[PDB]
Amino acid sequence: NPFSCKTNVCWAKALEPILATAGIVLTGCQWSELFPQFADDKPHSAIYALDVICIKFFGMDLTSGLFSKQSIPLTYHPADSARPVAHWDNSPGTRKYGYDHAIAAELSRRFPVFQLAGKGTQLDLQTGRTRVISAQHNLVPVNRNLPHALVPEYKEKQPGPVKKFLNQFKHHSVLVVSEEKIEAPRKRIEWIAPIGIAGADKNYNLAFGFPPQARYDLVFINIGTKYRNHHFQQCEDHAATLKTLSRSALNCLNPGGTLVVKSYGYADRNSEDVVTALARKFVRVSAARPDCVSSNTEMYLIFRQLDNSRTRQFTPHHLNCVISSVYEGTRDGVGAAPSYRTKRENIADCQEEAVVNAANPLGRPGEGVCRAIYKRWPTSFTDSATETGTARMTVCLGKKVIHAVGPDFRKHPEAEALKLLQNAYHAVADLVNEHNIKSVAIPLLSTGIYAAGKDRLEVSLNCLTTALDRTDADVTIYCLDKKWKERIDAALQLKESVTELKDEDMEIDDELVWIHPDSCLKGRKGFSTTKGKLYSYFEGTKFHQAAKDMAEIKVLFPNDQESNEQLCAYILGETMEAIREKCPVDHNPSSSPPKTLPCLCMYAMTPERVHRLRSNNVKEVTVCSSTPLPKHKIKNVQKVQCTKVVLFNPHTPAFVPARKYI
Numbered sequence: 001n002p003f004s005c006k007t008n009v010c011w012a013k014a015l016e017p018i019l020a021t022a023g024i025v026l027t028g029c030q031w032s033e034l035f036p037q038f039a040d041d042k043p044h045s046a047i048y049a050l051d052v053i054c055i056k057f058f059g060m061d062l063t064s065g066l067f068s069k070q071s072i073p074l075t076y077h078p079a080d081s082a083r084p085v086a087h088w089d090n091s092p093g094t095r096k097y098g099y100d101h102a103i104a105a106e107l108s109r110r111f112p113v114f115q116l117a118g119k120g121t122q123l124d125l126q127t128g129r130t131r132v133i134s135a136q137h138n139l140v141p142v143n144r145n146l147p148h149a150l151v152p153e154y155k156e157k158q159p160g161p162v163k164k165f166l167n168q169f170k171h172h173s174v175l176v177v178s179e180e181k182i183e184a185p186r187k188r189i190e191w192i193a194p195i196g197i198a199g200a201d202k203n204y205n206l207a208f209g210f211p212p213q214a215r216y217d218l219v220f221i222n223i224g225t226k227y228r229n230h231h232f233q234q235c236e237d238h239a240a241t242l243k244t245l246s247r248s249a250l251n252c253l254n255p256g257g258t259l260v261v262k263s264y265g266y267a268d269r270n271s272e273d274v275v276t277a278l279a280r281k282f283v284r285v286s287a288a289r290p291d292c293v294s295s296n297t298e299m300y301l302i303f304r305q306l307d308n309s310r311t312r313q314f315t316p317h318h319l320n321c322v323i324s325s326v327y328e329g330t331r332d333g334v335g336a337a338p339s340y341r342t343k344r345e346n347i348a349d350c351q352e353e354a355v356v357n358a359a360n361p362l363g364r365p366g367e368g369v370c371r372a373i374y375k376r377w378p379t380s381f382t383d384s385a386t387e388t389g390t391a392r393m394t395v396c397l398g399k400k401v402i403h404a405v406g407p408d409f410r411k412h413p414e415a416e417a418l419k420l421l422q423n424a425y426h427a428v429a430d431l432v433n434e435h436n437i438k439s440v441a442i443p444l445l446s447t448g449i450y451a452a453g454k455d456r457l458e459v460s461l462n463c464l465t466t467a468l469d470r471t472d473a474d475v476t477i478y479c480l481d482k483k484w485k486e487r488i489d490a491a492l493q494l495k496e497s498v499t500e501l502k503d504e505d506m507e508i509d510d511e512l513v514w515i516h517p518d519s520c521l522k523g524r525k526g527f528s529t530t531k532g533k534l535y536s537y538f539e540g541t542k543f544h545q546a547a548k549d550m551a552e553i554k555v556l557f558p559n560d561q562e563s564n565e566q567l568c569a570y571i572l573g574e575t576m577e578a579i580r581e582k583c584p585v586d587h588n589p590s591s592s593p594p595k596t597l598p599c600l601c602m603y604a605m606t607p608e609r610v611h612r613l614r615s616n617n618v619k620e621v622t623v624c625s626s627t628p629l630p631k632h633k634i635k636n637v638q639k640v641q642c643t644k645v646v647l648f649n650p651h652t653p654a655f656v657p658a659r660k661y662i
């Protein structure tokens, strides 16, 4: 009996029969060796545990589909009039799991060990060997594209004074959850500590979180997790902690408030799902590794200005870039807060690190800010040409000139144009992040001429901030006419002030997936038309295979347009093996989750739509403008405009192939 003398293991007990379908039967020592939470008898997420167990035995995470056979329900029960506390069991529900032999069978082509291994053994996918399950092996899932880099070797350090870090936040009174006292005489500190710690203002059992305190403008969660065998593993062990303490902190946080919480990054899928749900509630989120960290894997996440929004569309492009660069030494980072400003001056005279030109596709000089930029930095126009909806980095002596090309509204329908405008701004943001640009001078794209005789200030500005909230840069908007400056200042003052919540429900739903409105998954638990995460493999549904294949095609053809062309081929037949041959090189075992909401129109290319088309063996397909294709024409593919679009970053978030750490 593995559960002997353990008061909170219901999560493990609940997994037991699901593990059985895969031939896995864990002993008590094995449970303890795998989960510190089990060994220390603490509450935990059965789902997170299942992901960890899958990686440990099969060397891949749950997006592989290995446990996605719908057999045994895994059901979470919140406390209610019947149940004093939340509980995990196998009672009936729409969420089910079990070992999928079909998935294992297709996997056995590259990983024969699946077919040849015995039951209940840990698989080494590379060497092809097996062993009794061990927490020290299969440390990274081979099928995952990591959102950010990991540290090669764990090194502990002596932390500096935390006061230097807390002083970077403008708030006087701070709620502090920490195991060790924090000295900040310049602050008023309420100190919450775990149970055995003397000198604290409050003590709770932090494995269970903490009940609501008063509300603060700054909450600082300093609670860490013990390193064992690997960075990825540390993220795994920390994930439930991160969610629990973050959730408790949300009860203690005022609107417009800031939450700083210690993390190791979000390397594992669960950590990323959590950080994403959490991030959806804030205007901005960044990261820092100040001098007060105790190890090289420690990373403080900074969530700024809580409005607890529902429909906010968050993508980890920015955060991935930041965290990864910090771990690789390329960046600082630290918690000073980016800001917007306006200048009525000539942009050519800007003092900001980079200046953005409002450009045209041909990269030629023209009237506008572009006149000033050409006269002062002519050689930046040597090769400036870039397509509409994109931006190109060039340098003239000591200055970065980014040529961003907005849409001409006379030449495009309003929805498609809007998408292009947003994309130009996102590209500016991509460059700012990639080059760690500290300040940027930028005009309002498509408001001068390309505006087509109408006033685009509000919408151009909205695209600007939508994109540039996703950087760490200080932004200076240069403009035009005193009246336009008046209006921009007004909009910015409105935006910077968050005095109240947009919703009062503070739960962090890390499972929820945001789906297209015409999806047949509408109404199903775990999916929503109005909110949730923007990427999924749809494992556990019939769209999983379609999702995996789209993902792989994107791995084989990193260029968005070449990728979508091959996807068109795939919709029409040609299967996968053929496309893999069409690719010159070694395949990566890993991919990234396809976006679930590329557009709102009827042609949106979801794993769902791909599956419906391919299962109907259509002789032709229609593709909208939100699924970019090569400029030439493709047989049996009709190109049409997208009538309703989405404004978040369309690119695959940057990643590190897990294979690197394997």
Ligand SMILES: [Zn+2]
Residues within 6 Å of the ligand: 599, 600, 601, 602, 603, 604, 624, 625, 626, 627, 641, 642, 643, 644
């Ligand atoms: Zn569309």
